[PDB]
């Protein structure tokens, strides 16, 4: 119930079926324009669910106008690289990030692996995964990176 499901596919592309079967600064995004999970990428991938303006979780599947995603609250307090990605209503992949790449691109060649990576980024299927372990701001991060 925490996931926004505003998915218009009038162009009949089929991005919704693959969900069930087999830049800009990260601030606040309106749930009504989101389809599917919202992944924010600290040095590791984190899932963001729908909330109101205070941070209280909502369970309306992103239907109401007040449902938002607090991307800024997920920003690392230490100030490291940060970015979030998601799919919007008409099936396009959106990213946010500072001027590391935009969304999940730690490197212009690498990408943080996460369950819906092939759903948001189909062009990175043939990418090679590298197990990464590093400390960012006093916190250990274990994650995999898909590179060329």
């Amino acid at each position: 119930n925490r996931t926004a499901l505003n998915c218009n596919d009038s162009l009949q592309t089929g991005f919704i079926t693959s969900l069930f079967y087999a830049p800009r600064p990260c601030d606040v995004v309106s749930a009504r324009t989101v389809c599917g999970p919202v992944y924010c990428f600290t040095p590791s991938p984190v899932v963001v669910g729908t909330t109101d303006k205070l941070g209280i979780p909502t369970y309306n599947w992103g239907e109401n106008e007040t449902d938002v995603f607090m991307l800024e609250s997920l920003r690392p307090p230490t100030g490291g690289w940060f970015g979030c990605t998601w799919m919007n209503s008409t099936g396009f992949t959106k990213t946010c990030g500072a001027p590391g790449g935009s969304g999940p691109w730690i490197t212009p060649r690498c990408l943080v692996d996460y369950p819906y990576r092939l759903w948001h980024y189909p062009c990175t299927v043939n990418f090679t995964l590298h197990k990464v372990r590093m400390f960012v701001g006093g916190i250990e991060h274990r994650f995999d990176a898909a590179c060329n």
Partner: antibody, heavy 123, light 107 residues
């Protein structure tokens, strides 16, 4: 975009029938689907609907005992048991959608209709 | 909730302005839809959300109303508009339809 329905059926009283409805393309079932029946020379009457994401199913109070609505990847079906002469009607599947927000959790309008499957209950 | 349409039968000429009312036994907010059914064919969506025109529907079709009383308006009747018109509420848990309005054309 387009909906295919199974062919017309003639059934003796007391038996059961299963009517099915397909997307008629390479697509899989995503949106909520509903069944609307129309007796000959009569009005439209909602019987039941299924929501694939929730898996939940609703029915009409008059037929709750003998109707079941099932769905898989590409086919929604409607089964009626203990058929009687009053079940003679045309049976439509209709995709229920939210045209304001396209939210899968709150479908509130039938935007695409199958061309109907006519059932006759007769001995 | 219960939907009652007025009138049940309608007769008008090409170019006439016609209206059809739907009356809900209780408030349905704006979850009212209009459908057009030509003989032998499946119903076709005309107006959703009581007032929003569906993509591809000619602009002479229009809807208005809220709460318990609703209206479908055809600004200039055309021969293709010969059909039966149904209102449908999607507010409560069992979806319901109006009895339907048959629209005959005089010439």
């Amino acid at each position: 975009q387009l909906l295919e329905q199974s062919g017309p059926e003639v059934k003796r009283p007391g038996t059961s029938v299963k009517m099915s409805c397909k997307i008629s393309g390479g697509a899989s079932i995503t949106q909520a689907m509903s069944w609307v029946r129309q007796a000959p020379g009569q009005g439209l009457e909602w019987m039941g609907g299924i929501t694939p994401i929730f898996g939940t199913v609703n029915y009409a109070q008059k037929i709750l005992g003998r109707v079941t609505i099932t769905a898989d990847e590409d086919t929604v079906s409607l089964e009626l048991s203990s058929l009687k002469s009053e079940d003679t009607a045309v049976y439509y599947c209709a995709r229920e959608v939210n045209l304001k927000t396209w939210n899968l959790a709150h479908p509130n309008v039938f935007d695409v209709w199958g061309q109907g499957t006519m059932l006759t209950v007769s001995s | 909730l219960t939907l009652t349409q007025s009138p049940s039968s309608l007769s008008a000429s090409v170019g006439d302005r016609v209206t059809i009312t739907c009356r809900a036994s209780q408030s349905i907010s704006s979850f009212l839809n209009w459908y057009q059914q030509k003989p032998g064919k499946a119903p076709k969506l005309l107006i959703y959300a009581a007032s929003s025109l569906q993509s591809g529907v000619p602009p002479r079709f229009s809807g208005s109303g809220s709460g318990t009383d609703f209206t479908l308006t055809i600004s200039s009747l055309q021969p293709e508009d010969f059909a039966t018109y149904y209102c449908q509420q999607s507010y409560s848990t069992p979806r319901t339809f109006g009895q339907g309005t048959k629209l005959e054309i005089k010439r």
